[PDB]
Short mmCIF file of all heavy atoms in Angstrom, two decimals:
data_model
loop_
_atom_site.label_atom_id
_atom_site.label_comp_id
_atom_site.label_asym_id
_atom_site.label_seq_id
_atom_site.Cartn_x
_atom_site.Cartn_y
_atom_site.Cartn_z
N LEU A 83 101.08 122.48 34.38
CA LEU A 83 99.69 122.35 34.28
C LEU A 83 99.05 121.36 33.30
O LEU A 83 99.57 121.22 32.20
CB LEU A 83 99.10 123.78 34.05
CG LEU A 83 99.52 124.93 34.96
CD1 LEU A 83 99.07 126.29 34.45
CD2 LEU A 83 98.95 124.69 36.37
N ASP A 84 97.94 120.73 33.74
CA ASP A 84 97.15 119.93 32.86
C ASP A 84 95.78 120.64 32.66
O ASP A 84 95.01 120.85 33.65
CB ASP A 84 96.90 118.49 33.23
CG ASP A 84 97.78 117.73 34.11
OD1 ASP A 84 98.98 117.64 33.73
OD2 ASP A 84 97.45 117.21 35.21
N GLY A 85 95.51 121.03 31.48
CA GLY A 85 94.23 121.79 31.25
C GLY A 85 94.46 123.26 31.02
O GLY A 85 95.61 123.76 30.96
N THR A 86 93.35 123.92 30.87
CA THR A 86 93.28 125.35 30.66
C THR A 86 92.77 126.07 31.89
O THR A 86 91.85 125.67 32.51
CB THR A 86 92.24 125.71 29.41
OG1 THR A 86 92.82 124.95 28.32
CG2 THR A 86 92.16 127.20 29.15
N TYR A 87 93.60 127.06 32.13
CA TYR A 87 93.27 127.96 33.29
C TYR A 87 93.09 129.38 32.78
O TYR A 87 93.85 129.87 31.99
CB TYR A 87 94.42 127.83 34.28
CG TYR A 87 94.69 126.54 34.98
CD1 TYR A 87 95.24 125.37 34.43
CD2 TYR A 87 94.47 126.48 36.40
CE1 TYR A 87 95.46 124.25 35.20
CE2 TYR A 87 94.66 125.43 37.17
CZ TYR A 87 95.18 124.29 36.53
OH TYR A 87 95.36 123.20 37.30
N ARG A 88 91.92 129.89 33.15
CA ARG A 88 91.44 131.20 32.77
C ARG A 88 91.79 132.34 33.79
O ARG A 88 91.49 132.14 34.97
CB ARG A 88 89.87 131.26 32.72
CG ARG A 88 89.25 130.70 31.49
CD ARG A 88 87.74 131.03 31.51
NE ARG A 88 87.24 130.17 30.37
CZ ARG A 88 85.93 129.74 30.32
NH1 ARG A 88 84.98 130.15 31.11
NH2 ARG A 88 85.76 128.71 29.47
N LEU A 89 92.36 133.42 33.18
CA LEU A 89 92.70 134.51 34.16
C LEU A 89 91.35 135.11 34.65
O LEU A 89 90.49 135.47 33.84
CB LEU A 89 93.42 135.62 33.26
CG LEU A 89 93.56 137.05 33.89
CD1 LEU A 89 94.35 136.96 35.19
CD2 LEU A 89 94.34 137.90 32.89
N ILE A 90 91.15 135.22 35.94
CA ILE A 90 90.01 135.89 36.50
C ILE A 90 90.40 137.36 37.01
O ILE A 90 89.62 138.34 36.79
CB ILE A 90 89.45 135.01 37.63
CG1 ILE A 90 88.24 135.74 38.23
CG2 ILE A 90 90.42 134.46 38.72
CD1 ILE A 90 87.22 134.82 38.97
N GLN A 91 91.53 137.46 37.70
CA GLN A 91 92.04 138.72 38.26
C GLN A 91 93.55 138.68 38.50
O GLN A 91 94.24 137.57 38.45
CB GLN A 91 91.35 139.12 39.59
CG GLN A 91 91.25 138.05 40.73
CD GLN A 91 92.28 138.25 41.80
OE1 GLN A 91 93.33 138.86 41.65
NE2 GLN A 91 91.99 137.73 43.02
N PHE A 92 94.02 139.89 38.75
CA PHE A 92 95.46 140.08 39.12
C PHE A 92 95.43 141.11 40.20
O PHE A 92 94.49 141.98 40.23
CB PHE A 92 96.49 140.32 38.01
CG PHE A 92 96.55 141.70 37.37
CD1 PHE A 92 97.04 142.82 38.12
CD2 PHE A 92 96.10 141.85 36.03
CE1 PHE A 92 97.03 144.07 37.45
CE2 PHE A 92 96.16 143.08 35.42
CZ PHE A 92 96.69 144.23 36.14
N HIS A 93 96.37 140.97 41.10
CA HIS A 93 96.58 141.97 42.21
C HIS A 93 98.04 141.95 42.66
O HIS A 93 98.88 141.16 42.21
CB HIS A 93 95.62 141.84 43.36
CG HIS A 93 95.86 140.48 43.98
ND1 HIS A 93 95.33 139.33 43.34
CD2 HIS A 93 96.60 140.07 44.92
CE1 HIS A 93 95.69 138.29 44.05
NE2 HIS A 93 96.54 138.73 44.94
N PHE A 94 98.26 142.91 43.59
CA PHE A 94 99.65 143.08 44.09
C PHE A 94 99.70 143.02 45.65
O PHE A 94 98.69 143.15 46.32
CB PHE A 94 100.20 144.45 43.69
CG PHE A 94 100.39 144.72 42.20
CD1 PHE A 94 99.27 145.17 41.43
CD2 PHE A 94 101.55 144.53 41.57
CE1 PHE A 94 99.40 145.51 40.11
CE2 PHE A 94 101.76 144.86 40.18
CZ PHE A 94 100.64 145.33 39.43
N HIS A 95 100.94 142.76 46.06
CA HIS A 95 101.30 142.75 47.51
C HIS A 95 102.46 143.75 47.58
O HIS A 95 103.32 143.58 46.68
CB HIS A 95 101.73 141.43 48.13
CG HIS A 95 100.50 140.49 48.06
ND1 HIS A 95 99.58 140.36 49.08
CD2 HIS A 95 100.05 139.72 47.04
CE1 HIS A 95 98.66 139.53 48.74
NE2 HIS A 95 98.93 139.21 47.48
N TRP A 96 102.56 144.67 48.58
CA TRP A 96 103.74 145.62 48.55
C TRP A 96 104.08 146.05 49.94
O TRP A 96 103.32 145.78 50.88
CB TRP A 96 103.51 146.78 47.54
CG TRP A 96 102.40 147.66 48.00
CD1 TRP A 96 102.46 148.71 48.93
CD2 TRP A 96 101.05 147.53 47.66
NE1 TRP A 96 101.21 149.25 49.10
CE2 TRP A 96 100.27 148.50 48.37
CE3 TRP A 96 100.38 146.65 46.81
CZ2 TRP A 96 98.95 148.68 48.27
CZ3 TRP A 96 99.00 146.77 46.67
CH2 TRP A 96 98.31 147.77 47.41
N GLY A 97 105.31 146.73 50.01
CA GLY A 97 105.72 147.13 51.39
C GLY A 97 105.58 148.61 51.65
O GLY A 97 105.16 149.39 50.80
N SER A 98 105.90 148.92 52.84
CA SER A 98 105.92 150.31 53.40
C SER A 98 107.29 150.95 52.99
O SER A 98 107.38 152.18 53.01
CB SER A 98 105.72 150.53 54.88
OG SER A 98 106.32 149.54 55.64
N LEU A 99 108.31 150.10 52.65
CA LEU A 99 109.58 150.49 52.15
C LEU A 99 110.01 149.52 51.02
O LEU A 99 109.50 148.38 50.90
CB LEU A 99 110.64 150.31 53.32
CG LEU A 99 110.22 150.96 54.67
CD1 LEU A 99 110.71 150.13 55.80
CD2 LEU A 99 110.69 152.40 54.63
N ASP A 100 110.99 149.99 50.28
CA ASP A 100 111.50 149.26 49.19
C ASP A 100 112.13 147.88 49.53
O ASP A 100 112.17 147.05 48.64
CB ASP A 100 112.41 150.18 48.42
CG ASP A 100 111.73 151.30 47.55
OD1 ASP A 100 110.49 151.39 47.50
OD2 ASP A 100 112.57 151.97 46.87
N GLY A 101 112.43 147.69 50.83
CA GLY A 101 113.06 146.44 51.26
C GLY A 101 112.19 145.25 51.57
O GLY A 101 112.69 144.25 51.99
N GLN A 102 110.88 145.50 51.38
CA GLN A 102 109.91 144.40 51.70
C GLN A 102 108.66 144.66 50.85
O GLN A 102 108.47 145.76 50.27
CB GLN A 102 109.76 144.32 53.19
CG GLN A 102 109.20 145.66 53.71
CD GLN A 102 109.01 145.69 55.18
OE1 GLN A 102 109.98 145.56 55.97
NE2 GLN A 102 107.82 145.92 55.75
N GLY A 103 107.79 143.66 50.76
CA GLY A 103 106.49 143.78 50.08
C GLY A 103 106.16 142.49 49.34
O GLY A 103 104.90 142.21 49.18
N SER A 104 107.15 141.73 48.86
CA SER A 104 106.90 140.48 48.17
C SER A 104 106.52 139.40 49.24
O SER A 104 106.74 139.52 50.45
CB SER A 104 108.11 139.99 47.40
OG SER A 104 109.11 139.65 48.29
N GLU A 105 105.79 138.41 48.78
CA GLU A 105 105.22 137.32 49.67
C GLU A 105 106.27 136.16 49.56
O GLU A 105 106.83 135.78 50.60
CB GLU A 105 103.81 136.89 49.17
CG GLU A 105 102.74 137.91 49.57
CD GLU A 105 101.37 137.29 49.56
OE1 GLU A 105 100.93 136.50 48.72
OE2 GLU A 105 100.68 137.63 50.60
N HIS A 106 106.61 135.76 48.34
CA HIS A 106 107.65 134.75 48.06
C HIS A 106 109.00 135.45 48.29
O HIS A 106 109.01 136.73 48.19
CB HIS A 106 107.69 134.11 46.65
CG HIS A 106 106.52 133.19 46.49
ND1 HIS A 106 105.24 133.64 46.06
CD2 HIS A 106 106.32 131.91 46.94
CE1 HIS A 106 104.38 132.70 46.14
NE2 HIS A 106 104.98 131.63 46.66
N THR A 107 110.03 134.69 48.63
CA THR A 107 111.42 135.21 48.86
C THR A 107 112.41 134.26 48.07
O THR A 107 112.04 133.06 47.88
CB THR A 107 111.86 135.34 50.33
OG1 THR A 107 111.66 134.06 51.02
CG2 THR A 107 111.18 136.50 51.03
N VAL A 108 113.51 134.78 47.59
CA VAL A 108 114.50 133.96 46.87
C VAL A 108 115.77 133.95 47.67
O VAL A 108 116.32 135.05 47.84
CB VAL A 108 114.70 134.46 45.44
CG1 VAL A 108 115.70 133.57 44.63
CG2 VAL A 108 113.36 134.53 44.72
N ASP A 109 116.09 132.80 48.27
CA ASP A 109 117.33 132.78 49.12
C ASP A 109 117.19 133.88 50.20
O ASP A 109 118.17 134.54 50.44
CB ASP A 109 118.59 132.90 48.30
CG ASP A 109 118.74 131.65 47.40
OD1 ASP A 109 118.36 130.60 47.95
OD2 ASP A 109 119.22 131.74 46.27
N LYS A 110 115.99 134.00 50.68
CA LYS A 110 115.53 134.84 51.74
C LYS A 110 115.47 136.38 51.36
O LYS A 110 115.17 137.25 52.24
CB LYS A 110 116.37 134.71 53.02
CG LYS A 110 116.28 133.31 53.66
CD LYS A 110 115.05 133.25 54.50
CE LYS A 110 115.25 132.65 55.93
NZ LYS A 110 115.14 131.15 55.95
N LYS A 111 115.70 136.69 50.16
CA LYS A 111 115.69 138.10 49.61
C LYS A 111 114.21 138.49 49.36
O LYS A 111 113.40 137.80 48.65
CB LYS A 111 116.43 138.06 48.29
CG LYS A 111 116.55 139.46 47.59
CD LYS A 111 116.90 139.23 46.16
CE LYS A 111 117.42 140.53 45.53
NZ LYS A 111 116.53 141.66 45.88
N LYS A 112 113.85 139.60 49.92
CA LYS A 112 112.49 140.20 49.68
C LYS A 112 112.57 141.25 48.61
O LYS A 112 113.48 142.05 48.52
CB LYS A 112 112.01 140.86 50.95
CG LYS A 112 111.83 139.82 52.13
CD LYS A 112 111.51 140.64 53.35
CE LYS A 112 110.61 139.77 54.22
NZ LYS A 112 111.24 139.78 55.60
N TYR A 113 111.53 141.30 47.76
CA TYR A 113 111.43 142.33 46.66
C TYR A 113 110.52 143.46 47.13
O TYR A 113 109.94 143.20 48.18
CB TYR A 113 110.87 141.69 45.35
CG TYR A 113 111.99 140.90 44.69
CD1 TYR A 113 112.21 139.54 45.05
CD2 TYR A 113 112.78 141.49 43.69
CE1 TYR A 113 113.21 138.78 44.43
CE2 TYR A 113 113.79 140.73 43.10
CZ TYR A 113 113.94 139.39 43.45
OH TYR A 113 114.93 138.74 42.76
N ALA A 114 110.40 144.47 46.29
CA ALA A 114 109.51 145.64 46.72
C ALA A 114 108.05 145.38 46.68
O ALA A 114 107.19 145.84 47.43
CB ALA A 114 109.90 146.87 45.87
N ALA A 115 107.68 144.47 45.74
CA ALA A 115 106.29 144.04 45.55
C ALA A 115 106.30 142.67 44.80
O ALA A 115 107.38 142.23 44.40
CB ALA A 115 105.45 145.09 44.87
#
């Protein structure tokens, strides 16, 4: 980053089961949230 970025909000994304919920994936691996 160049400059200052101010936190406005935080939120979550989650699944119906522990095997999914994350938006990003790592080597196609999904996290719980």
Side-chain angles (χ1 to χ4, degrees):
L83 305 170
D84 335 301
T86 301
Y87 294 71
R88 279 189 190 154
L89 166 61
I90 180 159
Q91 53 103 335
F92 75 71
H93 58 285
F94 297 86
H95 296 267
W96 67 84
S98 38
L99 313 147
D100 285 0
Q102 62 182 62
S104 68
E105 285 201 317
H106 290 89
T107 53
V108 183
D109 292 325
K110 297 278 226 272
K111 182 199 197 313
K112 298 174 148 127
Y113 284 84

